[PDB]
């Protein structure tokens, strides 16, 4: 009948517990040792300048008010005990719409070690913001950040730290790559301190370096542009007696280049500078227009 003794242990733990007070409120600064396991790097939405990422967000602090002494060493408790104790309020500084999964039960975990060391993991789907400088489109490379810190707890109260060597904290699964357009190169973590109007907060940062794949843009813009230019230069080998043929060549090539420019500019966000593909399409337009002008002069 271990159920009764373990119930008594749990009720002694929660007897006289205040979850509005962080562990070590008077004489200590709480130390939250975080960690991340990226189960799948979601598709980088280029239109919204966002990206999705599915993580196992792990945290672990030391609560001295949750020491016990029983037959077991680690209490692998249910996720509903995590709501009766104090848990840090980590928020993502750039997350847009994050969801915590509730299928079939809350995807959470809580292991109370016998010496008070807690462990609390969640399964999240963070939709963060990745500001992009599309000046080398489609040969660009980005560094999508993921900044998370504490809310309501300044640096004098809750300090964050990686749980392993900072190079080995953020781990990405091997098969976890939902990227069809980009190519994940590597992660890069860092820890800093941001000032504010309310206080000084600790901010942990993680950049995922990407590298766009040019195959699709080649196939659907650069080949049609080059082929249109060739089809336009075909109009020079026709004899000078066939005027309508060369006129059709010129006009249809100019129309094709116009529609190609339009369809090529639609894929990108409505950006207010010129990309590399834009320069290529402009030069091809100039070539076809010059071919038409040369025919007119002839």
């Amino acid at each position: 009948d271990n159920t009764t003794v373990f119930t008594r242990i749990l009720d002694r733990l929660l007897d006289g517990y205040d979850n509005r007070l962080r562990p070590g409120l008077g004489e200590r600064v709480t130390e939250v040792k975080t960690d991340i396991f990226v189960t799948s790097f979601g598709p980088v939405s280029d239109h919204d300048m966002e990206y999705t990422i599915d993580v196992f967000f792990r945290q672990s602090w030391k609560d001295e008010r949750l020491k016990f002494k029983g037959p077991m060493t680690v209490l692998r408790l249910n996720n509903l005990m995590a709501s009766k104790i104090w848990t840090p309020d980590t928020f993502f500084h750039n997350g847009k719409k994050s969801v915590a999964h509730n299928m079939t039960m809350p995807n959470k975990l809580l292991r109370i070690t016998e010496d008070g060391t807690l462990l609390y993991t969640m399964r999240l789907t963070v939709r963060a913001e990745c500001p992009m400088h599309l000046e080398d489109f489609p040969m660009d490379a980005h560094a999508c950040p993921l900044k998370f810190g504490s809310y309501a707890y300044t640096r004098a109260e809750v300090v964050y730290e990686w749980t392993r060597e900072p190079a080995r904290s953020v781990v990405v699964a091997e098969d976890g790559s939902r990227l069809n357009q980009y190519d994940l190169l590597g992660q890069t973590v860092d820890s800093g301190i941001v000032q504010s109007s309310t206080g000084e907060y600790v901010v942990m940062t993680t950049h995922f370096h990407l590298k766009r794949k040019i195959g699709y843009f080649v196939i659907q813009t650069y080949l049609p542009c080059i082929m249109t230019v060739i089809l336009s230069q075909v109009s020079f080998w026709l004899n000078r007696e066939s005027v309508p043929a060369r006129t059709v060549f010129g006009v249809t090539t100019v129309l094709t280049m116009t529609t190609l420019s339009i369809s090529a500019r639609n894929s990108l966000p409505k950006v207010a500078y010129a990309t590399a593909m834009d320069w290529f399409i402009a030069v091809c337009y100039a070539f076809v227009f010059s071919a038409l002008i040369e025919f007119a002069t002839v």
Epitope: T117, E161, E165, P166, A167, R168, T188, V189, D190, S191
Partner: antibody, heavy 117, light 106 residues
Framework: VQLQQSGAELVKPGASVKLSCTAS????????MYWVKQRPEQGLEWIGR????????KYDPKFQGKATITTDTFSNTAYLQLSSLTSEDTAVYYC???????????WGQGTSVTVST | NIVMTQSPKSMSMSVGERVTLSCKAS??????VSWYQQKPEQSPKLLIY???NRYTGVPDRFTGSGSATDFTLTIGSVQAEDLADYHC????????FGAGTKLELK
């Protein structure tokens, strides 16, 4: 807060020395425990670390197999045992714990081992 | 393995003048570079944990300056007890220290 290492050792070449590092002022299960060597008038060098909560030990590639790092949670001690030693590793061995931003805030005092005949 | 090239090897400077030390990392180390001050016949003492954060008990004449790879330790009004080695060590990966700079008075 206060790390007490062992004393100096005078070991014959070809034997095994086991240096101890007793931590007083904290529990070793909370932090890591690094072992560093320093030959005379040279730079510091990393040997390996141990996570006393689990027992996961990592070593420098050039110290793999020669050294092993164990712990003792009852006495809050870290042990470094040099399995097979030549006459060249006559350095000073330090014991340190990781600090706030993964630095080594508290160092030991150094057990200067000596290999000769 | 990240290697830290610390410069210069040994400098000699008089009392009361500004001095600077450089530590260039090979790979990326975000701000996990620490500066230790080892006086002769003593154990190294942590000066700057992380880049530009003085440790408790360090005079305000020591300042760090961090980057991705290049790091700097500037001492201001240099006193007479600052004659010691100054090692720089990253911690972004498994810790690797620099060679150290023997500061001297002349």
């Amino acid at each position: 807060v206060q790390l007490q290492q062992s004393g100096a050792e005078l070991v014959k070449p070809g034997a095994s020395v086991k240096l101890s590092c007793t931590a007083s002022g904290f529990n070793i299960k909370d932090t890591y425990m690094y072992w560093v060597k320093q030959r005379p008038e040279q730079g510091l060098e990393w040997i390996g670390r141990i996570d006393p909560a689990n027992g996961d030990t990592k070593y420098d590639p050039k110290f793999q197999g020669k050294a092993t790092i164990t712990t003792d949670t009852f006495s809050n001690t870290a042990y470094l045992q040099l399995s097979s030693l030549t006459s060249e590793d006559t350095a000073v061995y330090y014991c340190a714990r990781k600090g706030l931003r993964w630095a080594m805030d508290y160092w030991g005092q150094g057990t200067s081992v000596t290999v000769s005949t | 393995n990240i290697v830290m090239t610390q410069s210069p090897k040994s400098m000699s400077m008089s009392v009361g003048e500004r001095v600077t030390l450089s530590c260039k990392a090979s790979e990326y180390v975000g701000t996990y570079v620490s500066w230790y001050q080892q006086k002769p016949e003593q154990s190294p003492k942590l000066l700057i944990y992380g880049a530009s954060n003085r440790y408790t008990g360090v005079p305000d004449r020591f300042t760090g300056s961090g980057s991705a790879t290049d790091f700097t330790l500037t001492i201001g009004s240099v006193q007479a007890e600052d004659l010691a080695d100054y090692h720089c060590g990253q911690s972004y990966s498994y810790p690797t220290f620099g060679a150290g700079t023997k500061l001297e008075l002349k």
